Amino acid sequence: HPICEVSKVASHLEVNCDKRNLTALPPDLPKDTTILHLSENLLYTFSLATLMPYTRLTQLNLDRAELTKLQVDGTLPVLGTLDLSHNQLQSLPLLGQTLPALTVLDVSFNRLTSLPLGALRGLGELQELYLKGNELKTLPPGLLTPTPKLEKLSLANNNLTELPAGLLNGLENLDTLLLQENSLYTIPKGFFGSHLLPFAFLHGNPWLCNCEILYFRRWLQDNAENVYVWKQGVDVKAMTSNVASVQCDNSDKFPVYKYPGKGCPT
Ligand SMILES: *[C@@H]1O[C@H](CO)[C@@H](O[C@@H]2O[C@H](CO)[C@@H](O[C@@H]3O[C@H](CO)[C@@H](O)[C@H](O[C@H]4O[C@H](CO)[C@@H](O)[C@H](O)[C@@H]4O)[C@@H]3O)[C@H](O)[C@H]2NC(C)=O)[C@H](O)[C@H]1NC(C)=O
């Protein structure tokens, strides 16, 4: 109670242990704790197990903590949100066997260059995945199979050149897809499926406007009302689209939805 700043507000309390040169979990944290901020600390190494005691813990922040190795010992059946952004994890952690109730996981701006074959197994309650800012160049086959309830996915600002044709297969709740600032050249036929994607960010990519981009073109047209441009400091980006932001080779004067496709089949 008297080490970090403990908030209160109706039952579920919030403990802030940020910017406090901590190298590990502080000993006198209230037991019936629910949210823990531990950002801007020196957690070069951290063991999810040391939280076994806080049976009411639902949100944990370990962002901007020079984190390099996350240990996944036992279980925290009630943890739903986990923030790992702005650390140095060279490999993505396997949380399935520990955070069965995790609905949000952010592992942005870390040092990821790929993702394992079972990466998200067990994470069936996931509703949000943030992996923006790494150096992913390719995604695994059924990555999102374990997460059929996914709503938001961020793979922005990586080095992706191609996306799996079925990456979205099954996700009928998906509403936000951020793939901006990558190295994508095309979208596999029927990639978006028939689902309705409200917020799709596809700008900043070197799209190759050849016949094999006519699928994406029609989609762009059908969903021009759903294509937006990212604004850092995000303003909920809830208003005014810009389908002309998706462009051939990133040339502003040659948006994809206006791509002619001269001499292409129907
Ligand atoms: C992922 O995509 C981003 C966005 O496109 C990309 O950023 C830019 O890439 C170029 C490289 O094509 C950057 O220039 C780099 O500068 C250093 C050179 O020392 C290196 O990062 C790159 O090449 C080096 O690679 C090794 C060192 O890492 C060595 O073999 C040797 O030093 C090579 O030169 C490249 O030259 C350019 O500055 C960035 N822009 C910025 C400021 O971000 C990023 O490079 C891509 N990363 C991957 C996964 O390749």
Ligand SMILES: [Pt+2]
């Ligand atoms: Pt960030």
Ligand SMILES: [Pt+2]
């Ligand atoms: Pt759908």
